[PDB]
Design a protein around this nucleic acid. Structure first.
Ligand SMILES: Nc1ncnc2c1ncn2[C@@H]1O[C@H](COP(=O)(O)OP(=O)(O)OP(=O)(O)O)[C@@H](O)[C@H]1O
Ligand SMILES: Nc1ncnc2c1ncn2[C@@H]1O[C@H](COP(=O)(O)OP(=O)(O)OP(=O)(O)O)[C@@H](O)[C@H]1O
Ligand SMILES: [Mg+2]
Ligand code: NA
Ligand code: NA
Lengths: 220, 551, 50
RNA sequence: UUGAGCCUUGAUGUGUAGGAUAGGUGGGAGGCUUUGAAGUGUGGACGCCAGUCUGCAUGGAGCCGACCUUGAAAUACCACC
């Protein structure tokens, strides 16, 4: 259907300005969905190499538009603070028997730098799943309010594809051109910070931004 | 098309002054498949040891492209006898396992605040990066998939208590788990059975990277290789084509070389006749012609071709009762290899023992030689029988000793049954016909190792032979010589092998292993064995599945 | 003339070497002797090289 | 007439367990198809032989997710791949 027309409508054989592409992105209004985005960027890194694998977290002015339920696996006197600071799933490390069984999914894995005795599944059943984060990523630290604030603001984590591709969300099209430009610039500068020790070619081989149903337009 | 590997003017010199490789200039391009041919001693394993970076002594320049991984499998894959199957396997993924253990150690940080963040949490990122470079967490599944695809033994099994074929499979799995871009294989089908070889050759055909494989066989080579590197005495000769066309080209090359050498002999004799004349007056004679004759008197390298000299000494006279087994049965733990096997060996017979890997082929030889004790007993030999046994593994010779010392033990006269034989003559009967007596056992090549093994183990003079994979590293020439020697044998022999053609050209009784530990015995050769199967056959033809490696 | 020329390279890390000959056929194992190293002025191990 | 490269458009990815061919993270919710089907008859291709992809014909509104007991999830796009 609408694909069999937007394929004719698109002219994705060129490289577009970041603000000359927002008009083409908004042109997709003829499609029916919630129209979130899946902005993807490349890198001059070899995912076979450990020292070139790129991972981290960011903070953006607006958010993803979806609530991410973050956990806090450090119970005790800090359990009340974790629950009242923005812990959508208040399950302590010693309280992971029942809340963990009840909640089969969430937004952000627990991050408790002052108490992280829990391992999880004994075989990477949670770390391998990606939800289980590490303190160096930015989740586990002495502060507890940091994780709650990141969950509320929808801080997104970078994941390195097999070919060095990094994918991220900005939200639905109800965000405006200026908001989109701000978020993509934040992502680009974060990638500039997180460029590894090897800088081959261009740190952004290609950058494209697309909706959940529509086309993907290069941002150059 | 950027190459993958390059050699320019690559040359190697061995003890004294012998140019095994002289001026080998070659380039290796992506997706290539090369089969390296040659006799037993040509320099194939040398060239692959150079290509692996292990040997830098060479003259010239050999180098791969940067950031391309070379997986080198030699033709002597070594493994840790203490290690079990998993203890040997994980070394191919050791980075992920070591990093995971370090993560386990690090996770006590968030328990106890001792040197909390600025000292090890940052390095936790490097550890998670080394995990990320691979799958890391989904690693047990990777290991299980590799074991399933390669039909590995269960991880609880040790490495010393492993059959040669499964040992080679373990080496193959540990090599391919590294996931390289250029495979160097030094006889990768040394101890493999039919299904394992077929799977390996299909995998090699599917392999995206470059493959350089040394093989003395022809059918697997026709399967895998894209072109051939002949690697004659000194010089490497590329070739596009199949094994039979390459063979034809090789005979033409050798015939032309023989003709040119004969013409050289003719011309040298003529010019010597001229040199041996007088001046006849006060005239020239001439120094230019003298110089031409002196430079014409040069040296040419004869082929060190083994050919038909493999000396199997005749044993004592053999009566009609040679060997008999009754209801033989053997099991290990819960898996049973031989169950209710009975058969008698008439004199003069060659028994081709065939079957899959670790089916019990070598353990049968252990029982016959008396080093193992069967559960159901009743193994017997005639009183005239004298046993000479050749093992599947060459790990019994002192690599320090020379060829002559190791074969003969230092005694100038060698006793073989009734007749005393000169040790040097006996050793030279096995193609060590020159100063090759002085070479060291460790410095010998794989095929020369097999030849020396046969020479050392046939001297006992038994009229019953128990040969276990006797043609492992041998080429076609030594293989044919051994086949002829086996045919001209008065006694009887039992040969375990995986070469169907070699077994078919000599076997008179087939002893074939099957599933559930049944060892079918068939008196006859392979032609009539196949005819019997066709006479009473089953309706299907599809063995393999060709599972996978990736994902 | 079967005794090729070899140099024993110091293991002290400096580039210093004694030089000698060796029967490369009868003695394939690499030579190893404790000789004086005038660079560091200590008797250290020298190992065979090309 | 070809050879090589590059960009697009397609087509393709049988381990075990799983409903049955599951490439990778996606990132999100349901869309798909009705711009005529979940199919039957037919033709080719792949085929690790289970099978899913395909040009057609009247008939053209129902196929999967979501539910989870599997290391992973459901061709439900454009993607740079
Ligand atoms: N240090 C040495 N001194 C003298 N001769 C040596 C030395 N090392 C190796 N050789 C000889 O060099 C020859 C080449 O051996 P190499 O292993 O390269 O042969 P190959 O054809 O690859 O063998 P194979 O196919 O049987 O594995 C052999 O005859 C070997 O004895
Ligand atoms: N002591 C032992 N304990 C347990 N299992 C053993 C022991 N010795 C051998 N095995 C196993 O029993 C089987 C017997 O194999 P064996 O060494 O007799 O030769 P094969 O497998 O018939 O032939 P090939 O050597 O050609 O592979 C193999 O699977 C081997 O790993
Ligand atoms: Mg020198
Ligand atoms: Na070799
Ligand atoms: Na064995």
């Amino acid at each position: 259907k609408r694909m069999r027309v937007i394929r004719e409508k698109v002219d994705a054989t060129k490289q577009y300005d970041i603000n000359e592409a927002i008009a083409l992105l908004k042109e997709l209004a003829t499609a029916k969905f919630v129209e979130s985005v899946d902005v993807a960027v490349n890198l001059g890194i070899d995912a076979r190499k450990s020292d070139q694998n790129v991972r981290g977290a960011t903070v953006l002015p607006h958010g993803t538009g979806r609530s991410v339920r973050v956990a806090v696996f450090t119970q005790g006197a800090n359990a009340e603070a974790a629950k009242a600071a923005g812990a959508e799933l208040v399950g302590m490390e010693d309280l992971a028997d029942q809340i963990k069984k009840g909640e089969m999914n969430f937004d952000v894995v627990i991050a408790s730098p002052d108490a992280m005795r829990v391992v999880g599944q004994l075989g990477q059943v949670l770390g391998p799943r990606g939800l289980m984060p590490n303190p160096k990523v930015g989740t586990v630290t002495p502060n507890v309010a940091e994780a709650v604030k990141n969950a509320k603001a929808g801080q997104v984590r970078y994941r390195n594809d097999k070919n060095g591709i990094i994918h991220t969300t900005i939200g639905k099209v109800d965000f405006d051109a200026d908001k989109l430009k701000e978020n993509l610039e934040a992502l680009l500068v974060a990638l500039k910070k997180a460029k590894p020790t090897q800088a081959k070619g261009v740190y952004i081989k290609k950058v494209s931004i697309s909706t959940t149903m529509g086309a993907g337009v290069a941002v150059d | 098309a950027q190459f993958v590997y390059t050699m320019h003017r690559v040359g190697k010199v061995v003890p004294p002054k012998r140019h095994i490789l002289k001026n080998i200039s070659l380039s290796f391009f992506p997706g290539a498949k090369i089969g390296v041919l040659g006799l037993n001693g040509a320099g194939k394993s040398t060239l692959l040891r150079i290509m692996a970076g292990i040997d830098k002594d060479i003259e010239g320049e050999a180098r791969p492209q940067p950031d391309i991984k070379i997986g080198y499998l030699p033709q002597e894959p070594q493994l840790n006898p203490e290690h079990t199957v998993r203890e040997s396997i994980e070394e191919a993924v050791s980075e992920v396992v070591n990093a995971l253990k370090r993560l386990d150690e690090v996770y006590a940080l968030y328990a106890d605040p001792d040197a909390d963040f600025d000292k090890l949490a940052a390095e936790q990122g490097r550890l998670e990066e080394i995990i990320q470079a691979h799958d890391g967490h989904n690693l047990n599944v990777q290991l299980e998939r590799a074991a399933d695809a390669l039909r590995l033994p269960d991880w609880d099994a040790k490495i010393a208590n492993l059959s040669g074929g499964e040992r080679r499979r373990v080496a193959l799995c540990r090599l391919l788990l590294e996931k390289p871009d250029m495979l160097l294989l030094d006889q990768p089908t040394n101890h493999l059975d039919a299904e394992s070889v077929a799977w390996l050759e299909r995998f090699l055909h599917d392999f995206e990277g470059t493959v350089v494989a040394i093989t003395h066989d022809r059918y697997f080579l026709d399967n895998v290789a894209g072109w051939i590197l002949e690697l004659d005495r000194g010089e490497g000769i590329p070739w596009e084509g199949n094994y039979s066309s390459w063979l034809e080209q090789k005979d033409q090359r050798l015939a032309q070389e023989a003709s040119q050498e004969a013409a050289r002999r003719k011309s040298i004799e003529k010019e010597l006749e001229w040199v041996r004349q007088g001046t006849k007056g006060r005239q020239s004679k001439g120094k230019a012609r003298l110089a031409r004759f002196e430079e014409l008197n040069s040296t040419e390298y004869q082929k060190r071709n083994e050919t038909n000299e493999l000396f199997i000494p005749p044993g004592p006279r053999l009566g009609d009762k040679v060997l008999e087994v009754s209801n033989l049965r053997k099991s290990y733990g819960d898996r049973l290899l031989i169950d209710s096997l009975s058969f008698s060996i008439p004199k003069g017979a060659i028994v081709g023992i065939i079957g899959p890997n670790g089916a019990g082929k070598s353990t049968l030889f252990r029982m016959i030689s008396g080093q193992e004790q069967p559960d159901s007993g009743t193994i017997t030999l005639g009183e005239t029988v004298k046993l000479a046994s050749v093992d599947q593994f060459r790990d019994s010779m002192d690599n320090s000793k020379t060829v002559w010392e190791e074969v003969s033990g230092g005694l100038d006269i060698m006793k073989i049954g009734n007749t005393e034989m000169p040790s040097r003559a006996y050793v030279g009967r096995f193609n060590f016909k020159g100063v090759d007596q002085g070479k060291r056992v460790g410095e010998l090549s794989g095929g020369e190792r097999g030849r020396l093994h046969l020479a050392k183990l046939l001297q006992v003079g038994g009229n019953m032979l128990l040969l276990d994979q006797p043609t492992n590293d041998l080429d076609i020439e030594t293989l044919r010589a051994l086949e002829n020697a086996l045919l001209e044998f008065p006694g009887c022999a039992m040969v375990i092998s995986h070469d169907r053609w070699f077994l078919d050209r000599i076997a008179t009784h087939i002893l074939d292993y099957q599933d559930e530990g049944k060892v079918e015995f068939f008196e006859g050769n392979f032609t009539e064995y196949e005819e019997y199967k066709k006479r009473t056959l089953g309706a299907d033809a599809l063995e393999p599945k060709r599972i996978k490696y990736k994902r | 003339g079967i005794r090729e020329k070899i140099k024993l390279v110091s293991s002290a890390g400096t580039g210093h070497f004694y030089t000698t000959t060796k029967n490369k056929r009868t003695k394939p194992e690499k030579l190893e002797l404790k000789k004086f190293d005038p660079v560091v002025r200590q008797h250290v191990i020298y190992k065979e090289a090309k």
